[PDB]
Amino acid sequence: FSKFVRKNPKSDKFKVKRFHHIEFWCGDATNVARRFSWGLGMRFSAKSDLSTGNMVHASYLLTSGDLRFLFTAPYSPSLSTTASIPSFDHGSCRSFFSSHGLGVRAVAIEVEDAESAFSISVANGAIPSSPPIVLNEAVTIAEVKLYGDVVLRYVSYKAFLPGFERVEDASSFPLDYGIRRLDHAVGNVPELGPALTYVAGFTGFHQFAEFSGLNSAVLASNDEMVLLPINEPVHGKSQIQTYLEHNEGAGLQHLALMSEDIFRTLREMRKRSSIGGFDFMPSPPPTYYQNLKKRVGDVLSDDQIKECEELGILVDRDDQGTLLQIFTKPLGDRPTIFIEIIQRVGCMMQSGGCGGFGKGNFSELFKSIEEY
Amino acid sequence: FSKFVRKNPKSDKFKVKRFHHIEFWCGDATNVARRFSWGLGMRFSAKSDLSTGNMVHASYLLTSGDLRFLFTAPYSPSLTTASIPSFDHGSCRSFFSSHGLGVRAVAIEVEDAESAFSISVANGAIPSSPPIVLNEAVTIAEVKLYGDVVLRYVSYKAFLPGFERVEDASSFPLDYGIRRLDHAVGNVPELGPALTYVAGFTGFHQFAEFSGLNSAVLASNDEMVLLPINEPVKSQIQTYLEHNEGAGLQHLALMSEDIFRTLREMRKRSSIGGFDFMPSPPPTYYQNLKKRVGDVLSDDQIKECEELGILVDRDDQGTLLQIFTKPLGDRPTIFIEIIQRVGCMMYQSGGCGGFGKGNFSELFKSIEEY
Ligand SMILES: CCN1c2ccc(C(=O)c3cnn(C)c3O)cc2N(CC)S1(=O)=O
Ligand SMILES: CCN1c2ccc(C(=O)c3cnn(C)c3O)cc2N(CC)S1(=O)=O
Ligand SMILES: [Fe+3]
Ligand SMILES: [Fe+3]
């Protein structure tokens, strides 16, 4: 008697595969990469610093399944090229970090051909940031402006990056809390309209249909595995407006990290919150989890709803699947970028965006807190 | 029969008590403090950020015993409410862009910071921040030490105003045995003008000395505040100056009540967010220990040094156990020394056992064989 109809034109102007990596720009990459590695359970797998010959910048790669986190900091220009990332600029990293703080600089996706994806993007309105550059006849990398100071990096292959030496573990069994891949990367913009027209104008990404102080929209690729949601603030206190003021303009709001077992990951992450890891936002009242069995009782057992209450995980669902989700506190000094830990249940063939993004938890949390 | 004669003029131009804190300037203080907290075992105990009203800078205080590490990072100027009145946005950005993560202030406890500041400037010291009384309770002033590092004078009348305490709220709060700062060392291009300048406005006397650098130690009257300086003679000091872009603090020696407990805990966390250590001496170094420190350390404590890579040195009066970490940040500049002094129990004489100058030959000797 109820039905939600999804439509997918599959209008991608170029062939995109998966998310490749996320590049944070830092002031000191070593302390941030080691903070994230311990708090998130990501292995130190590659690097491109002075120990490898790179006298321009220091970059460290953390991996966990298919998720790649790159942490890049600039060296002093008096060390002069030996840079392994050709898009890197000292005056651009300093300006980015001095104005936005710790945050995401590049959102990298894998494509069939970064050189073609760059020409089609620029030809369809995108502002170019870094032209296509072929590294060692193996990898091609191009960058276009996404929003604010974030660039959409195109990555393509011929068969991590050239100039990176792989880092091998000294621990008996390396770090791993269950995070396997990036699900979606969300940015905040002043006006949602021009952002959607711009991004979808050069990517061909269609809008993913949805089942507080913001207006949200999700741009998705043909297979809906690369998800780029965007939020604008609703005025008349909004976190999006608080984001833009402390970030000095638009920027990436949060990254959702998919876990093969969100209880395993939250058990590890919450263990380390006060000993170097990441803190989490306040948990819903106990009335929230008592209301779970009546709306997700056919998906989660009685012992699994108990497990969400102990860890602070929110549950949401739509017409196709179910979503387990929780949010960390801001990763750095500024109340800007944070991290979401999710696990999607259902839509097995696993469809992209299964269970939605948790928009129903706005009222579900508001309704549950109203038991006071 | 040998004897080492030490002289102490006690020429302090003002009353100096003890080391108060060390302040790191960062780009993101949150990730630097949390990384140091896990690898060193220091407790998050105070803060001054926007959650407390400070819209100028974010400052976090890690403590372990009497050791105080402050981590400060600047906010966006588009946001005074600053708790550190000497803080400057245009100075912190320039500092971190030229030296990277490093020590900005070496703070010492004094009887009167305003008197210590006036006597310093009148004796050649370059002023950095004038005496400023905070909430009619604390006075802080800053003079140039070397490079962009400043010597900070702190005095009381009975951490700092504007700082709210944060309760650990853990059953095993972080503690690896570190208790206080022993000494803080800086590298300079020319040691001569540095000693003349620093000792010229402090009255600190040279601490008598029982590879690639020339060093001297400036100590206070009680020799509990030790400020050594290094110049280059291939030299790590020269490589430091190139990457640090001038003079600056080289390392901080953290005094531990049990260096074995601390080294276990720190080596446990090297690959999971903590700190890495410099290569350990060959096994011939530790086979030669019993004929060097056999009357101080037991055989099983020498075993404990070999398992942890700890270096042991000795002088006329005391014995010193020490070890060194790798650089704390991107640049091969500032590192950390972990020490434990044995002997000179009087309630312990500062600089007991020296600073490990004898380990340069002892380490080179141990590599000769094997
Ligand atoms: C429970 C209420 N909250 C909620 C719900 C969903 C999403 C979300 O992930 C989302 C919403 N739209 N799109 C596209 C998305 O990815 C974020 C957040 N919060 C912010 C941390 S929250 O805790 O306030
Ligand atoms: C080869 C033994 N090494 C050693 C010995 C003593 C000190 C030291 O703490 C010291 C010496 N003089 N002053 C004033 C200090 O504070 C540092 C270091 N190394 C660190 C690069 S080391 O491994 O080369
Ligand atoms: Fe999300
Ligand atoms: Fe030392």
From Swiss-Prot, chain A:
- Per the record, the major location class is cytoplasm
The Gene Ontology CC terms held by the record are:
cytoplasm
The domain of life is: Eukaryota
The residues forming a coiled coil are none
The pathway it acts in is:
Amino-acid degradation; L-phenylalanine degradation; acetoacetate and fumarate from L-phenylalanine: step 3/6; Cofactor biosynthesis; prenylquinone biosynthesis
Identify a single GO molecular function assigned to this protein: iron ion binding
Q: Which parts of the sequence belong to the VOC domain?
A: 18-157, 181-329
Q: Which Pfam families match?
A: Glyoxalase
Give a yes or no for keyword Repeat in this entry. Answer: yes
Q: What class of enzyme is it?
A: oxidoreductase
Q: Enumerate the catalysed reactions.
A: 3-(4-hydroxyphenyl)pyruvate + O2 = homogentisate + CO2
Q: Which GO terms describe its biological process?
A: L-phenylalanine catabolic process; tyrosine catabolic process
- Which keywords, in A-to-Z order, does the entry hold? Cytoplasm, Dioxygenase, Iron, Metal-binding, Oxidoreductase, Phenylalanine catabolism, Repeat, Tyrosine catabolism
Localization: Cytoplasm
- Which NCBIfam families does the annotation name? 4HPPD
Q: Which family does it belong to?
A: Belongs to the 4HPPD family.
Q: What does this protein do?
A: Catalyzes the conversion of 4-hydroxyphenylpyruvic acid to homogentisic acid, one of the steps in tyrosine catabolism.
UniProt name for this protein: 4-hydroxyphenylpyruvate dioxygenase
Where does this protein come from, organism-wise? Arabidopsis thaliana (Mouse-ear cress)
Gene name linked to the record: HPD
From Swiss-Prot, chain B:
The record, for Pfam families, names: Glyoxalase
| One function term, GO molecular function aspect | iron ion binding
The record's remark on the cofactor is: Binds 1 Fe cation per subunit.
Residue ranges occupied by any VOC domain in the UniProt entry: 18-156, 180-326
Highest taxon listed in the record's lineage = Eukaryota
Q: Which GO terms describe its cellular component?
A: cytoplasm
What cofactor does its activity depend on? Fe cation
**What Enzyme Commission number does this protein have?**
1.13.11.27
Q: Which GO biological process entries does UniProt record here? A: L-phenylalanine catabolic process; tyrosine catabolic process
Which InterPro entries does the annotation name?
4OHPhenylPyrv_dOase, 4OHPhenylPyrv_dOase_C, 4OHPhenylPyrv_dOase_N, Glyas_Bleomycin-R_OHBP_Dase, Glyas_Fos-R_dOase_dom, VOC
Catalysed reactions, semicolon-separated: 3-(4-hydroxyphenyl)pyruvate + O2 = homogentisate + CO2
Residue numbers binding Fe cation: 183, 251, 337
Q: Which UniProt keywords apply?
A: Cytoplasm, Dioxygenase, Iron, Metal-binding, Oxidoreductase, Phenylalanine catabolism, Repeat, Tyrosine catabolism
Compartmental location? Cytoplasm
Give, as one word, the top-level EC class.
oxidoreductase
Pathway this chain belongs to: Amino-acid degradation; L-phenylalanine degradation; acetoacetate and fumarate from L-phenylalanine: step 3/6; Cofactor biosynthesis; prenylquinone biosynthesis
**Similarity comment:** Belongs to the 4HPPD family.
**Known PANTHER family for this protein?**
4-HYDROXYPHENYLPYRUVATE DIOXYGENASE
- Subunit note: Homodimer.
Role, per record: Catalyzes the conversion of 4-hydroxyphenylpyruvic acid to homogentisic acid, one of the steps in tyrosine catabolism.
User: What is the protein name for this chain?
Assistant: 4-hydroxyphenylpyruvate dioxygenase
| Organism of this sequence | Arabidopsis thaliana
Gene this chain is encoded by: HPD
